[PDB]
C-alpha cells in the first residue's frame, strides 16, 4: 500500500528484489543511483512486465530515444530485451521506470557460483613465511570447462550481435547475468547506463565513445571470464593477475590460455571478436548437440498430454450446453422430444449410481466414454432414466450428431442468426 499499485496500464505490483529503504542514502554502486525492482501487468496487451525504478533521477535530454529505439529493435535469446522506458510521478519522487518482461528463476553469477567465500579464500589467503606447495590440479569445486566454454559462447554471441547493431552493453558484470535453468544466460540492465551517463557534451554525436565502450566491454569480459575460471572474483585484481595466469596454465587448456592472453594483455588494437571465433573450435559441436538433445527430450515429453486442451474444451462445451434454463419449457427437451437423449446422456455420465444406491463416480469411465464419443465409434450404449420409465440404446455417432446440432443452434442464437 505504501507504493502506489497503479501506474498507467500497470497493476498488481509486487516487490522482487530486497527493497532499498527510502532512507538509504547509499546509492547502488553498479550505476550510481538508488534502484528498486518490481513486477506489474500491462493492460494494453495483458502481458507481465518487470519494472526497474530509479530514484531522484530526472530525464533531462530527449536525444537518447534513438538509442532506445535501437534497443527495442534489438532482440536476442540470452538478452533481457529492452521494451520501454518512461517517467513516473505517482511515486514519492519523480522516477524513471524501465519495463522489461520477467523471467522467473533468474539467478546471478555470484548467487549461483560465487556465493562461497572459500572460492575466494585462495586469493585472499597469504602464506606468511610458509613455503607455497603445489596447487591442486583438481581444485575442489572446479567447474567442467565445457560450462565455461558455453558461457563464453553466449557472451561472445551477445557482444557480436550488439556490435553488429553498433551499440555498447557496458554491463559486463556477473551481477547482470541470470542463468535461467542450468545454462541459458540472460544479460541484464540494457540501456540503464545509456540513460544515466547520457551526455550531450560529445558535439551532439553520441557515437564518439562507442569504440571505447566496446574495448571496455571486452576488457571487462576478460576479467569476468578469468573470474569464472578461478570461480572467484578475487583473481581479476591486478595483484593476482599472474596468480590467475599460472592457475590457468596448471588447470586449463592452451586454448583458454591464449584467450586470456589475447584479451588481458591487449593487442593495442581495435580487436575484432571474429579473431577469436576459431579458438573455441570443436567444442561448438558439443554445445549444439547438448541443445539438440534437450529439444529431443522435451519434444518427446510433449506427446504425454497432447489431448488435454482438446478434452478440457470438450467439457467446456458440455457445461455451456447442459443445464440451460431457456430450454426447460421447450417440449423438444421433454421426454417426448428428440433432445431428451441429451439429458439422459448427461444423467448416465454424471448421475449414474451403484446398484446399492451409493454414488458411482469413475473418472476412468468418464474418460473412456469421452474417448468413444470423440471417436464416434459404432459401439452402442444404453441410457436409463432415474425411474427406469424409458430406456434407449443408441450408438455414439448419433450422440455426436445431436451434440453438434445443438451447439450449432446455440452458436447461431448467440450470433443472431435465429
Amino acid at each position: 500500500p505504501a507504493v502506489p499499485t497503479e501506474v498507467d496500464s500497470y497493476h498488481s505490483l509486487f516487490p522482487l528484489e530486497p527493497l532499498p529503504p527510502p532512507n538509504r542514502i547509499q546509492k547502488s554502486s553498479n550505476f550510481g543511483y538508488i534502484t528498486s525492482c518490481y513486477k506489474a501487468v500491462n493492460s494494453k496487451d495483458d502481458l507481465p512486465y518487470c519494472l526497474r525504478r530509479i530514484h531522484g533521477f530526472r530525464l533531462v535530454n530527449t536525444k537518447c530515444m534513438v538509442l532506445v529505439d535501437m534497443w527495442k529493435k534489438i532482440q536476442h535469446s540470452n538478452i533481457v530485451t529492452l521494451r520501454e522506458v518512461f517517467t513516473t510521478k505517482a511515486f514519492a519522487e519523480p522516477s524513471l521506470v524501465f519495463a522489461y518482461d520477467f523471467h522467473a528463476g533468474g539467478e546471478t553469477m555470484m548467487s549461483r557460483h560465487f556465493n562461497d567465500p572459500n572460492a575466494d579464500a585462495y586469493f585472499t589467503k597469504r602464506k606468511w613465511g610458509q613455503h607455497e606447495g603445489p596447487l591442486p590440479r583438481q581444485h575442489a569445486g572446479l567447474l567442467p570447462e565445457s560450462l565455461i566454454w558455453a558461457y563464453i559462447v553466449q557472451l561472445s554471441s551477445a557482444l557480436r550481435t550488439i556490435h553488429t547493431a553498433g551499440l555498447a552493453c557496458r554491463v559486463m558484470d556477473p551481477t547482470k547475468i541470470l542463468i535461467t535453468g542450468k545454462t541459458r544466460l540472460r544479460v541484464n540492465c540494457v540501456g540503464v547506463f545509456d540513460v544515466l551517463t547520457f551526455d550531450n557534451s560529445q558535439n551532439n554525436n553520441p557515437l564518439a565513445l562507442m569504440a571505447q565502450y566496446q574495448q571496455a566491454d571486452l576488457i571487462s569480459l576478460g576479467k569476468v571470464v578469468l573470474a569464472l575460471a578461478c570461480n572467484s572474483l578475487a583473481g581479476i585484481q591486478r595483484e593476482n593477475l599472474q596468480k590467475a595466469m599460472e592457475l590457468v596454465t596448471i588447470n586449463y587448456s592452451s586454448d583458454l590460455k591464449n584467450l586470456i592472453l589475447y584479451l588481458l594483455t591487449d593487442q593495442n588494437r581495435m580487436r575484432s571478436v571474429n579473431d577469436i571465433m576459431p579458438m573455441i573450435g570443436a567444442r561448438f559441436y558439443t554445445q549444439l548437440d547438448a541443445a539438440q538433445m534437450r529439444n529431443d527430450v522435451i519434444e518427446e515429453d510433449l506427446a504425454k498430454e497432447v489431448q488435454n486442451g482438446r478434452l478440457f474444451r470438450l467439457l467446456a462445451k458440455l457445461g455451456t450446453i447442459n443445464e440451460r434454463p431457456e430450454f426447460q419449457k421447450d417440449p423438444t427437451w421433454s421426454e417426448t422430444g428428440d433432445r431428451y437423449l441429451l439429458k439422459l446422456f448427461r444423467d448416465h455420465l454424471f448421475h449414474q449410481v451403484t446398484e446399492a444406491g451409493a454414488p458411482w463416480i469413475d473418472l476412468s469411465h468418464i474418460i473412456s466414454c469421452l474417448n468413444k464419443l470423440d471417436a464416434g465409434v459404432p459401439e452402442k450404449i444404453s441410457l436409463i432414466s432415474r425411474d427406469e420409465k424409458s430406456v434407449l440404446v443408441v450408438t455414439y455417432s448419433d450422440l455426436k450428431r445431436c451434440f453438434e446440432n445443438t451447439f450449432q443452434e446455440l452458436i447461431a442464437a448467440a450470433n443472431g442468426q435465429l
Binding site: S43, D46, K304, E305, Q307, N308, R310, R313, L314, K317, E335, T336, D338, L341, D362, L363, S364, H365, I367, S368, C369, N371, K372, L373, D374, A375, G376, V377, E379, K380, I381, S382, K389, S390, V391, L392, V393, V394, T395, D398, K400, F403, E404, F407, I411
Partner: protein, 401 residues
Amino acid sequence: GVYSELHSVVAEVGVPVSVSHFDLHEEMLWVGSHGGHATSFFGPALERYSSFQVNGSDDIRQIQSLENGILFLTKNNLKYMARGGLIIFDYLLDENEDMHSLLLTDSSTLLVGGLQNHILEIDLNTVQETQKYAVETPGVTIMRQTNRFFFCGHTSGKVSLRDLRTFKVEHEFDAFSGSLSDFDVHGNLLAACGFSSRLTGLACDRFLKVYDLRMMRAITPLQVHVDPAFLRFIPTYTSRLAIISQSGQCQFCEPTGLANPADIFHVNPVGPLLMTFDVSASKQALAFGDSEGCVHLWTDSPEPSFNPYSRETEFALPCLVDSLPPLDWSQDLLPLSLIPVPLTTDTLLSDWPAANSAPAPRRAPPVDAEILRTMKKVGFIGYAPNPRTRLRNQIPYRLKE
C-alpha cells in the same frame, strides 16, 4: 397345432394394451398401451428391448414393422422411429381425423384411416400425403390387403372389398346391422364377427358371417358358443378360425365345418378383458393383450421361431467399469493418458470457430456501492435485494466493438 401358454408379461401396470404387433423382420414384438407408452420385447424370453413414451395424450392404435424402423400410430400423429428410439420422421395428422387403421401396402406407402370419411395414402420417405380417397361409409377401423382387393371393415357392421388400384367400392357385405368387431380374409374365405341390433339392443352375434370369395356369397353362418369379438384365419393345415371373445373364451373352428365345443379354450375367462390379438406369420405364436396391459403368448412349439427367416438382433454391452486403471481424483499429478484412446481421422466433434475461440482479459468489476451498503451478512451468504439494473446473468464485461 395346439397352442399352449409360453409366457405372459406386463407392458404397463394398470394401463391397457391398446395395440400389439409382432415385428416381421426380427424376433421382436411391440406393445402400445392406451396411455401413450410403448415397449418392444425380444424372443420367447420376453426381454425388454426399448421402452418410451411415444405421445403424451393419444392412445396407440396400430404398429407397423418396416425394414428400416417402426411406425407408431396414435389418435393425432404418425411416428416413424428407429428401433433404438431415434426419431426418423414425425408426421402430425389432422386433429379432426380419428386416426385408427394402418396398412403397409409396400415398403414406402402407408394407408391411414379411421372414424373419418377419408383414407390418406402417404409416402413415408418423403413424409408427405400423396393421395386422399373418400369413403362413403366412415368408420373404417380394420384394414387388410390381399393380392386381390382391399378389405375394409366398417363400424356399421359392413365389409367392403375395393379395387387395389382405384379404391372404388366393388363389393359389399352387410355382415351386421349393428357394429363390426373383427373380420379376417384368407385365400377363398372371409370370416366376420361383430355386434347386431336386436329387440334387446346391440349385442354380440354368435353366428360368424362366413363368405366364400370363390363364389361371392354368404355361406351358412357358424354358430359359436362364445361372444366372438375377433376372428383370425390360422392356415397351419386347414384355415382354422381362431374365434376370440373379449371375455377370454376362444375357440378353434372350421371355416366350412361345424363348431365343436371341444375346440373351446380359455385365455383369461375371469378378470382381464381381451383387447388386442395377433398371430405370428409362422403361425407358431399368438399374442393377447388384455385390459390390464398384460400380453400373453401361446405357442404350438416349445421354442418357435417367430419368423422362419429371422435376422440377428444386436444387444448393447453394459459399461465395462472394472477394466480401466484406477486414478485418484485427489492425486492431481498422475498422468491422465493411461486411459485407452482410439483414434478417428474425422474433424473433432466440438471444434470451435475462430471468433468464439479467442481468449481475452475478463477482470470482474467491483461491487456496486448500493449493493455494498444494502448487503447484510447472514452466516456466509450475502443477502442483498436485486438492484434490477441488469439482466439475469448479463455480461459483466464491456464487449469491444
